[PDB]
Design an enzyme around this catalytic site. Structure first.
Site, mmCIF file in Angstrom:
data_model
loop_
_atom_site.group_PDB
_atom_site.id
_atom_site.type_symbol
_atom_site.label_atom_id
_atom_site.label_comp_id
_atom_site.label_asym_id
_atom_site.label_seq_id
_atom_site.Cartn_x
_atom_site.Cartn_y
_atom_site.Cartn_z
ATOM 1 N N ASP A 140 0.800 -1.198 0.000
ATOM 2 C CA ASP A 140 0.000 0.000 0.000
ATOM 3 C C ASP A 140 0.850 1.273 0.000
ATOM 4 O OD1 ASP A 140 -2.736 1.000 0.556
ATOM 5 O OD2 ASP A 140 -2.403 0.949 2.753
ATOM 6 N N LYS A 143 4.688 2.928 -3.531
ATOM 7 C CA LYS A 143 4.984 2.162 -4.753
ATOM 8 C C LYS A 143 6.454 1.799 -4.977
ATOM 9 C CE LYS A 143 2.275 5.142 -7.041
ATOM 10 N NZ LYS A 143 1.856 5.970 -8.195
ATOM 11 N N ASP A 168 -1.535 -2.348 -4.148
ATOM 12 C CA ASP A 168 -2.461 -1.291 -4.545
ATOM 13 C C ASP A 168 -1.787 -0.221 -5.381
ATOM 14 O OD1 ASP A 168 -5.118 -0.064 -4.402
ATOM 15 O OD2 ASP A 168 -4.092 1.501 -3.236
ATOM 16 N N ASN A 169 -2.583 0.530 -6.188
ATOM 17 C CA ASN A 169 -2.138 1.651 -7.038
ATOM 18 C C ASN A 169 -1.077 1.232 -8.067
ATOM 19 O OD1 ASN A 169 -2.492 4.327 -7.932
ATOM 20 N ND2 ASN A 169 -1.203 5.176 -6.326
ATOM 21 N N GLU A 198 -18.030 3.607 -12.784
ATOM 22 C CA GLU A 198 -18.969 3.889 -13.900
ATOM 23 C C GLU A 198 -18.268 4.614 -15.072
ATOM 24 O OE1 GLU A 198 -21.921 7.085 -12.732
ATOM 25 O OE2 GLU A 198 -20.762 7.244 -10.864
#
Ligand SMILES: [K+]
Length: 213
Positions: A140, A143, A168-169, A198
């Site tokens: 997390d 990076k 993550d990311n 969406e």
């Protein structure tokens, strides 16, 4: 309340139900969305994280990197009795806010916060923290630490056949060094997850690397 992480906690205390993890998770999300910091982590990162936990039911989870404690709350709420989450965070402010968040959630029972460098704490996990092997690793926030930390967990023998590493990311084209390693090496079985919500643009990217021994 001056820092962003302090404001997240201020918003949680003023809105979330004390002892209710979902209320907390929703409060963090509602606030991060209105202030345009994290679009919809609750359905982006969240749902992937949940799916991974329910699928593997890990007894020992190690979180490498914490900020406001969202990931820690999201993960701890799904753990089984006897299961534990060890969270490692170098920043004492992020580590403090995370503790307070867990305390507010009523999940501190299931979590152990380790304030210090990953490079220094990982080699201490086996003796100092009664760890044989990790069932899951959650990478997390930081990076540039994913690759060295992975390589370190391997060096330290903390990974076993089936250990799940969820990063993550991990969005294209960012964090390619870590990706080239896990995807390249026959030691990891990889699955990428790209959450769009969406929209037509990647809201969040997550790599699941299963260690093969
Ligand atoms: K691979």
């Amino acid at each position: 309340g001056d820092t962003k992480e302090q404001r997240i906690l201020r918003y949680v205390q003023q809105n979330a139900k004390p002892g209710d993890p979902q209320s907390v998770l929703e409060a963090i999300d509602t606030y991060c969305t209105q202030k345009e910091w994290a679009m919809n982590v609750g359905d982006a990162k969240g749902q992937i994280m949940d799916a991974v936990i329910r699928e593997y039911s890990p007894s020992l989870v190690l979180e490498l990197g914490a900020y406001c404690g969202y990931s820690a709350v999201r993960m701890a709420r799904l753990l089984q009795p006897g299961a534990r989450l060890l969270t490692m965070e170098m920043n004492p402010d992020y580590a403090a806010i995370t503790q307070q968040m867990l305390n507010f959630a009523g999940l501190q029972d299931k979590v152990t916060i380790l304030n210090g460098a990953s490079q220094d704490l990982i080699p201490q996990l086996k003796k100092k923290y009664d760890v044989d092997t990790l069932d899951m690793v959650f990478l997390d926030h930081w990076k540039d630490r994913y690759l060295p930390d992975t390589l370190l967990l391997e060096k330290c023998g903390l990974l076993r056949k089936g250990t799940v590493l969820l990063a993550d990311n991990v969005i294209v084209p960012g964090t390619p060094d870590f990706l080239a390693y896990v995807r390249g090496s026959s030691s990891f079985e990889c699955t990428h997850y790209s959450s769009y919500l969406e929209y037509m643009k990647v809201v969040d990217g997550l790599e699941k690397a299963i260690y093969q021994g």
